[PDB]
C-alpha cells in the first residue's frame, strides 16, 4: 500500500545517507543517486530538468519535504512490465522473448546516452556472459522493474 508512512521511513533512511551535515537537507548533485538507490527510475535529462526547475544554477539544495515532493512527482509517472517489454521487443529478431548478447552491447554502449565500463563489468560479471547468442529478456522485465 504505496506512499503510506511506512514507505516514507526507508525514504528518510536513504535521505539520511546524503544529509551529511544533519540538518534535513541534501544537495541537487546526488538527487538521482538517492532516488535510484530507493529503486525509482528517472532518465538523465528528466532528472536534470527536475533540478533546473528548482534552480537555473543547477548547483543547490533540497529539504526532506520537497525531496518527498520529487519522489511523489516520479511515482505519478511510473513504467509497467508491458511498457518495458515493448522496449526490448523492438529488437527481437524471432518473436519468442530472446535478444542477441552482441546487439545487447551495441544497445548498452553505442546507441543512446550509454552505460559506462564499470556498469558493463558489474552487470556482465553477475550475468556471467562469454558469448553473442540469443538470450531471454522476459527475465530482465521481471527482475529490473
Amino acid at each position: 500500500d504505496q506512499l503510506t508512512e511506512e514507505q516514507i521511513a526507508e525514504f528518510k533512511e536513504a535521505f539520511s545517507l546524503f544529509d551529511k551535515d544533519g540538518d534535513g537537507t541534501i544537495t541537487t548533485k546526488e538527487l538521482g543517486t538517492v532516488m535510484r538507490s530507493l529503486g525509482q527510475n528517472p532518465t538523465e535529462a528528466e532528472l536534470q530538468d527536475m533540478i533546473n526547475e528548482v534552480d537555473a544554477d543547477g548547483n543547490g539544495t533540497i529539504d526532506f519535504p520537497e525531496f518527498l515532493t520529487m519522489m511523489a512527482r516520479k511515482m505519478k509517472d511510473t513504467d509497467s512490465e508491458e511498457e518495458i517489454r515493448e522496449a526490448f521487443r523492438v529488437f527481437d529478431k524471432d518473436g519468442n522473448g530472446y535478444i542477441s548478447a552482441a546487439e545487447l552491447r551495441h544497445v548498452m554502449t553505442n546507441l543512446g546516452e550509454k552505460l559506462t565500463d564499470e556498469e558493463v563489468d558489474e552487470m556482465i560479471r553477475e550475468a556471467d556472459i562469454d558469448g553473442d547468442g540469443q538470450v531471454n529478456y522476459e527475465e530482465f522485465v521481471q527482475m529490473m522493474t
Binding site: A14, T33, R36, S37, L38, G39, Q40, N41, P42, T43, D79, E83, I84, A87, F88, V107, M108, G112, E113, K114, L115, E119, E122, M123, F140, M143, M144, T145
Partner: protein, 48 residues
C-alpha cells in the same frame, strides 16, 4: 528505457548490498563492544 532500467537496477542492487554490508559490520562491532564490556565487568567484579 532499457539504459534507464539497467542503471536504476544496478544502483538499487548496490544500495541493498551496501545496507547488508553495513548491518554485517555493525552487528559484529556491537558484538565486539558487548564482549569488551563483559571483559570489563568480570575484571571490575574480580578486582573489587
Amino acid at each position: 528505457r532499457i539504459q534507464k532500467t539497467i542503471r536504476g537496477w544496478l544502483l538499487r542492487k548496490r544500495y541493498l548490498c551496501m545496507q547488508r554490508a553495513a548491518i554485517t559490520v555493525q552487528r559484529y562491532v556491537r558484538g565486539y563492544q558487548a564482549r569488551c564490556y563483559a571483559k570489563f565487568l568480570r575484571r571490575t567484579k574480580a578486582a573489587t
